[PDB]
Design an enzyme around this catalytic site. Sequence first.
Site, PDB file in Angstrom:
ATOM      1  N   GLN A 152       0.788  -1.231   0.000  1.00 22.80           N
ATOM      2  CA  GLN A 152       0.000   0.000   0.000  1.00 22.80           C
ATOM      3  C   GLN A 152       0.822   1.285   0.000  1.00 22.80           C
ATOM      4  O   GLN A 152       0.299   2.356  -0.322  1.00 22.80           O
ATOM      5  CB  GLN A 152      -0.974   0.013   1.190  1.00 22.80           C
ATOM      6  CG  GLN A 152      -0.327   0.289   2.525  1.00 22.80           C
ATOM      7  CD  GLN A 152      -1.314   0.119   3.690  1.00 22.80           C
ATOM      8  OE1 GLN A 152      -1.956  -0.924   3.839  1.00 22.80           O
ATOM      9  NE2 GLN A 152      -1.433   1.152   4.512  1.00 22.80           N
ATOM     10  N   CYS A 181      -5.345   0.382   3.507  1.00 20.99           N
ATOM     11  CA  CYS A 181      -5.489  -0.984   3.994  1.00 20.99           C
ATOM     12  C   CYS A 181      -6.956  -1.443   3.916  1.00 20.99           C
ATOM     13  O   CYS A 181      -7.242  -2.590   3.567  1.00 20.99           O
ATOM     14  CB  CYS A 181      -4.976  -1.086   5.434  1.00 20.99           C
ATOM     15  SG  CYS A 181      -5.884  -0.013   6.592  1.00 20.99           S
ATOM     16  N   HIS A 208      -6.315  -1.162  11.811  1.00 22.77           N
ATOM     17  CA  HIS A 208      -5.744  -1.615  10.541  1.00 22.77           C
ATOM     18  C   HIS A 208      -6.573  -2.724   9.887  1.00 22.77           C
ATOM     19  O   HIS A 208      -6.813  -3.768  10.491  1.00 22.77           O
ATOM     20  CB  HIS A 208      -4.301  -2.080  10.806  1.00 22.77           C
ATOM     21  CG  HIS A 208      -3.535  -2.433   9.567  1.00 22.77           C
ATOM     22  ND1 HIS A 208      -3.443  -1.589   8.480  1.00 22.77           N
ATOM     23  CD2 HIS A 208      -2.825  -3.541   9.245  1.00 22.77           C
ATOM     24  CE1 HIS A 208      -2.715  -2.164   7.539  1.00 22.77           C
ATOM     25  NE2 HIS A 208      -2.327  -3.350   7.976  1.00 22.77           N
ATOM     26  N   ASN A 254      -1.652  -9.245   5.000  1.00 20.65           N
ATOM     27  CA  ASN A 254      -1.457  -7.810   5.197  1.00 20.65           C
ATOM     28  C   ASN A 254      -1.253  -7.137   3.821  1.00 20.65           C
ATOM     29  O   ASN A 254      -1.241  -7.816   2.779  1.00 20.65           O
ATOM     30  CB  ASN A 254      -0.236  -7.596   6.106  1.00 20.65           C
ATOM     31  CG  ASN A 254      -0.164  -6.189   6.681  1.00 20.65           C
ATOM     32  OD1 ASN A 254      -1.083  -5.400   6.533  1.00 20.65           O
ATOM     33  ND2 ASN A 254       0.947  -5.873   7.332  1.00 20.65           N
TER      34      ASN A 254
HETATM   35  N1  LIG Z   1      -4.020   1.685   5.995  1.00 17.12           N
HETATM   36  C1  LIG Z   1      -5.123   1.753   6.716  1.00 17.12           C
HETATM   37  C2  LIG Z   1      -5.319   2.557   8.004  1.00 17.12           C
HETATM   38  N2  LIG Z   1      -6.555   2.220   8.793  1.00 17.12           N
HETATM   39  C3  LIG Z   1      -7.787   2.340   8.294  1.00 17.12           C
HETATM   40  O1  LIG Z   1      -8.007   2.682   7.132  1.00 17.12           O
HETATM   41  C4  LIG Z   1      -8.957   2.014   9.242  1.00 17.12           C
HETATM   42  C5  LIG Z   1      -9.562   0.653   8.881  1.00 17.12           C
HETATM   43  C6  LIG Z   1     -10.777   0.241   9.714  1.00 17.12           C
HETATM   44  C7  LIG Z   1     -11.255  -1.172   9.349  1.00 17.12           C
HETATM   45  C8  LIG Z   1     -12.456  -1.647  10.180  1.00 17.12           C
HETATM   46  C9  LIG Z   1     -12.169  -1.546  11.681  1.00 17.12           C
HETATM   47  C10 LIG Z   1     -11.606  -0.161  12.078  1.00 17.12           C
HETATM   48  C11 LIG Z   1     -10.417   0.244  11.193  1.00 17.12           C
HETATM   49  N3  LIG Z   1      -9.962   3.088   9.134  1.00 17.12           N
HETATM   50  C12 LIG Z   1      -9.619   4.342   9.442  1.00 17.12           C
HETATM   51  O2  LIG Z   1      -8.479   4.592   9.844  1.00 17.12           O
HETATM   52  N4  LIG Z   1     -10.579   5.312   9.311  1.00 17.12           N
HETATM   53  C13 LIG Z   1     -11.996   5.026   9.045  1.00 17.12           C
HETATM   54  C14 LIG Z   1     -12.627   6.083   8.119  1.00 17.12           C
HETATM   55  O3  LIG Z   1     -12.313   7.405   8.565  1.00 17.12           O
HETATM   56  C15 LIG Z   1     -10.917   7.655   8.517  1.00 17.12           C
HETATM   57  C16 LIG Z   1     -10.197   6.723   9.483  1.00 17.12           C
HETATM   58  C17 LIG Z   1      -5.254   4.070   7.799  1.00 17.12           C
HETATM   59  C18 LIG Z   1      -4.769   4.574   9.177  1.00 17.12           C
HETATM   60  N5  LIG Z   1      -4.161   3.404   9.842  1.00 17.12           N
HETATM   61  C19 LIG Z   1      -2.871   3.746  10.440  1.00 17.12           C
HETATM   62  C20 LIG Z   1      -2.115   2.542  10.993  1.00 17.12           C
HETATM   63  C21 LIG Z   1      -0.717   2.529  10.970  1.00 17.12           C
HETATM   64  C22 LIG Z   1       0.006   1.450  11.510  1.00 17.12           C
HETATM   65  C23 LIG Z   1      -0.675   0.373  12.079  1.00 17.12           C
HETATM   66  C24 LIG Z   1      -2.071   0.375  12.104  1.00 17.12           C
HETATM   67  C25 LIG Z   1      -2.781   1.451  11.564  1.00 17.12           C
HETATM   68  C26 LIG Z   1      -4.081   2.347   8.873  1.00 17.12           C
END
Ligand SMILES: N#C[C@]1(NC(=O)[C@H](CC2CCCCC2)NC(=O)N2CCOCC2)CCN(Cc2ccccc2)C1
Length: 217
Positions: free
Chosen positions: A19, A25, A164, A184
Amino acid sequence: LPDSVDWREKGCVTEVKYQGSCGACWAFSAVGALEAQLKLKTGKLVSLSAQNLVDCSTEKYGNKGCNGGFMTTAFQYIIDNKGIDSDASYPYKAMDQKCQYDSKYRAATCSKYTELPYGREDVLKEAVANKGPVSVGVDARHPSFFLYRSGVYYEPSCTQNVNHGVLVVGYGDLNGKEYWLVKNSWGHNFGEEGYIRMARNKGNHCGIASFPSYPEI
Ligand SMILES: N#C[C@]1(NC(=O)[C@H](CC2CCCCC2)NC(=O)N2CCOCC2)CCN(Cc2ccccc2)C1
């Protein structure tokens, strides 16, 4: 239920994707789940467009492209849109772009999705065995997660506050430790060629069974 499952053995899992610096993700998790169903339905394994979701399943779906999204709402976008394009036709750029969906490049459809009951690892096991890979969210913010190399991942500091989106493509037992086989989207360099075995039946470890869902065709 089978003691172990690995959808890769059934040719239902596409190559691990990278990604990059775009928080897509959620889109990779979603297409990965649909990819398995598409294979089960048509006999062909085809990578689907994560970018299509990033650029098109946006505000109306509560998603924010490279800044995060939801697998369930991505599934609904595919249903509403009546399709999703192939990865080859709409390549991943790890950037927010204008929506360029084109039905001439459609590679899959979705008619519905199901969200599993919160934290029930037994229900998740049944779904993985009887339906196919399942999109889930895990708490992957701990340093140990980025450094995982082999064995079964168990982190005492893990929580059920997930952040994530990943894909469960199987489950099993390794040296006395039950695990969930997780695909992943940080490329082949991460973990075991892009996969991580996460602790199973260990109190919903890292929230793996907190928010599971799977699409159907
Ligand atoms: N890619 C993706 C991310 N996550 C998402 O997109 C998560 C995925 C969801 C899946 C269902 C359960 C809850 C989480 N969503 C998420 O962050 N949102 C949801 C929509 O509004 C914006 C923020 C972007 C930010 N995250 C940062 C990160 C970094 C390192 C480890 C874990 C997470 C990784």
